[PDB]
C-alpha cells in the first residue's frame, strides 16, 4: 500500500492558479496568497478556483470571502472529474456505510478541526468498553 | 490463351511430357518473349528437375503467357528441331 | 482511386485473377512504394496462384491513382500484354477542387456545397490554422455560432482544400449527423457508424448492445484501421451525447453552444 | 442528361397527368452511343409509387439486395432507413462507378430524402416540387 | 541501424536484390563479425541468387550501424561500384514522452493527463519502486 | 547493366556461345576488372567445363558485373583478337 | 565447439578458403577422427568440387565435429605441412 | 510387398546403402520391369546424387513395386555380380 492521503504545499497551489489565470507569480494579486491557505491542499478545490477565475478575471474578493464562510455549495463547475462540487464526493463516500453505523458517525461531528482526541472520551460517548469502540473507529 | 488452346495443351499432356526436349528450348522461348529468365530458372527446378518435370511445368505455365502462347510455342518447337512434336500439336489446333 | 480506374478493375477482375502470377507484380509495387510488406504477406498466405491474384486485386481496389498506375506498369513490364490492354483505358491521371477532392470526400464525409454561395475566406483560413495546430494528437476544434448563422456549410468548405487534406489528413475524412437525440437514437448512430467504418468486415458481424463497447470498437478501429483521419460531428446538443464519441481522436464539431466541450479531456479551441 | 459528364446530379421530367411520360424516359436511355460512352456502369430502375415508411424500407432492402450479385457484403437486413442509405452510397461509389439510377413515379419529399447520396438520378413524375430537399445541380 | 541508413537500404532494395551474389558478401560480413553462420545458412537455403540476396537484405535491415558499414565495404571491395554508390549517402556514423509512450498507451489504457498539472515527483517515484 | 545491354546479350546468345574463345579472354577480363579470379575459376568449371559451357556462364554472369560491363566486354574481345565477335556485338548496340 | 572457436573460424574464412590445401589433409583428419569417410566424400563434392569449395565446406562442417575440433584441426594442418596456415590460426586462438 | 519383405529391407538398410552398386543395376531392374525409366531418372537424382543417396531411394521406392519386388531385386543383384549382397538378403528372407 502507498498512502496518497497527503495534500499539496503552497508552491504547487500557486503554480496551478498561475497556469489557470495566465500570469507569473509577481503579477498575481495579493489575495492569491490568502485564498490558497483556506483551500487546504486538495487539488480539487484549487482546480475549482483556478477554473472559475478563468472566466471572471475579477471575482477575487468574492471567492476570498465566500470560501471563508466555509460554505462550499456556492462553488460549482463541470470538468473531467465526475462530480460537480466538493460536497458531492464526500456525500458519496458517506452513503456506502452500513445502516448500523451511520448514526455512530454523525456523533463524531463534535470534534474541533485540529483537536486530537484520546479514545476514552468516545467510550464515554457511546457508553461501551474500550476495544469495542476502537474497532469501529478502525 | 483461349479455352481451345488450353484444352489442346491438356489433351496432349502425355505426349508433351514424354517427348519435349527442354534444354535446347529455352533460347527459343526467350527469343519470342514467352518467358522471363527467372521464370525459366523456376521451371528448371520444378519437382525433381528431370526433363519430364521441367516439361510438365513448362506446359502448365505456358497457359498463362498470352493469347498467342500456343502458336508461338509451336514455332519454338520448330526452331529447335522438334518438328514431330510441333506437327502433333498443329494438326490438332487445326483439327 | 478514381471511379473510372476502379470500375475498369472491377470489370476485368476475373481475367486478372486467372492469369496474374503475383510474385512478378508485388515486387515492382513494393519497389514503387505502393504495396506494403504486410499486404504482400497476406497475399503470399493464399495457397493458389489465382487466390493470391484475387487477394492482391482486393487490396489494389482500395488504393490510389498512383497505385493503379504502379500495377499497370508492372503488368506491362512483365509481359502481360493482354491484361495491360484491358486496363489501359482505365488509367487515371497522376501527379482547389481536384481529383483528390472528389476522390476522398465522396465517402459521405461532406454534403455538397450549395448551388449559390459567396466565398468567405477570412474565417475559413482561421479554421485551417487552428485545425493545423494539431500535427496530430487527440484534439478538439469547435465552432459555435448564432442561431441560423452560416455555419455547417462553412465547415464543409473548410476541409475543401487539397493541400490541407493531403498533407495533414491522409487518413480519410468522416462525417456524422447527430442532431437532437436520445439514448436509443444515439446508440443507433453508433452501430451505424462503426458499421460504416469497416468495409472489409475485418471484425465479426454482430451488434454491440451497450454504448461502451461501441465506444471501444470505435477507438480500436480509428487507431488501427484509420490512422490520422478527421472525424467530424454535426450539430451536437448535449454533454453526455458527446461523452460516448470520445476516445483519443481528432474532432471538428459545429454547433450552437460553447459549453458541451465541457466533459472531454485534452486540448481545446 | 449529357450535361453531366458525371458528378452527382439530377434530371427531372414532370408532366400532365396521364401524359406519355414513363415510356418516354424508357426510350431515352435506348441509344447505344449514349449508354456506351456516358454510362458504362450499367443502368438501374426502381418502381417507387405511392408508399409509406414500411414499404419504402422494403424497396430499400430489395434494392441493395439487387445491387450486389456476388454477396461481397454479408447477408443481413438493415433495419433503419439510414444504414440502407449508407450501403447504397458505398456500393454505388465502389461497386458501380458511373452508372445511372432511375426512379419511377416519386410522390413525396421525404420519400426522396432516403435515396439521396452522391449519385446520378433521372426521375419521372407528376410534380416539380419534390426535387425540393436535395442538394446539388438540378434540371 | 539509424533510420537514414535503413531507409537508404529500403529505397534501393530492388537493385540490390537483383545484382548481389551473396557468396562474395557473406564471407566478408562473417569475417567482420556482423553476420552469423546461422543467418548464412538461412541465406544459402534460398534456391536462386536473387532469393539469397533478398534474404540477406532482410537480415541486414534489422542490424546495427556497423553492419551496414560492413555490408557497404564488402560491396565496394567486391567491385559492386554502382551498388555501393547507391548506399553511400546512407552510411551511418560508427564507433519522458516518446514514440513508445503514445504507441502503447493509446490503447485506451490511459486517460490523457489534464491541461494543467503540477508535477508531483516524490510520490510517483515511490509507486514506481513498489 | 541496363535492360538494353542485357537484352543484347540474350539476343546474341547463340552466336556468343558458338564462337567465344575463353581461354585467351581471362587476362583481358581481369585487366578491366570485370571479374574476380575466383569468379573466373567458377565460370571455368560451369557445367561440363567445355568451351561452350564456360562461354555461356560467362555471358550470363556478365549481366551482373556493372553498368559498363558490356562495352568493357567488347573491348576485351577486341584485345584478344575476337574482332568478328566484337563487331557483331557493337553493330547491335548501335543498332 | 565453443563460440570463440566458431567465431575464429568465421573471422579466418577468407584466409582458410584462399590457402587451405585439402587433398593432402584427409588422411590427417581421419587419423584424428575429425570426420567419417563418407563425410569426406560429401565435402569433396561440395559446390563445384574446386579446392576452394571443398575447403569452405570443410571449415563450415568443422564447427560441428566437437569441443576440440579446432585444436585438432590445427594439428592436422601442422602434420601436412601447412604450418603457415596453422600459425595464422593459433596466433588468433591465443589472441 | 508383404510386411516381412518390407521389414527385411529396413533391417538391411545400412548394408544396402553401404554396399549397393547402382550404375550397373539399372539395366537389370528394367529387364525385370521393376521400375519405369523416368522412375530411374528420379532415383538417380535423389538427394545429392551420390551412390549412397541413389541406393537409399532405390530401396525405399522398391517397397512399392509389387508383391515380388524383393525376390526380383535379389535376382538383379545376382545378374550384376553383387552376389555377396544378394546372399546377405536371401539368407534373411529364408531366416
Ligand atoms: N456560403 C454560403 N453562401 C450562401 N448561403 C449560405 C452560405 N452558408 C450558409 N448559407 C445559407 C444558405 C444555406 O442554405 C443556410 C445554411 O446555413 P448553415 O451554416 O447550415 O446554418 P447551420 O445549420 O450551420 O446552423 P444550425 O446547425 O444551428 O442550424 O445558410
Ligand atoms: N410512344 C408512345 N406511343 C404510343 N402510346 C404511348 C406512348 N407513350 C405513352 N403511351 C401511351 C400508351 C401507354 O400504354 C400509356 C403510358 O403512358 P405513360 O408515359 O406511362 O404515362 P405515365 O405513367 O408516365 O404517367 P404517370 O406515371 O403519372 O401515370 O400512354
Author numbering:
A (entry chain D): 279 to 416
B (entry chain O), F (entry chain R), G (entry chain Q), H (entry chain P): 1 to 95
C (entry chain E): 1 to 95, 105 to 278
D (entry chain F): 140 to 278
E (entry chain D): 1 to 95, 105 to 139
What did the paper state?
When released, cytochrome c binds to β-propellers in Apaf-1 and may trigger nucleotide exchange with ATP/dATP replacing bound ADP/dADP. Thus, CARD-CARD interactions target inactive pc-9 monomers to the apoptosome.
The cytochrome c molecule appears to interact preferentially with the 8-blade β-propeller through an extensive contact region, which is apparent when the map is viewed at a lower threshold, which provides a better estimate of the all atom volume (boxed region 1). In our model, the HD1-WHD loop forms the bottom of the nucleotide binding pocket. In brief, the disk contains four pairs of Apaf-1/pc-9 CARDs in one turn of a spiral with the fourth pc-9 CARD being present at lower occupancy. This arrangement creates a mismatch between the CARD spiral in the disk and the c7 symmetry of the platform. We also identified density in some particles for catalytic domains from a single pc-9 that are 'parked' on the NBD ring of the central hub.
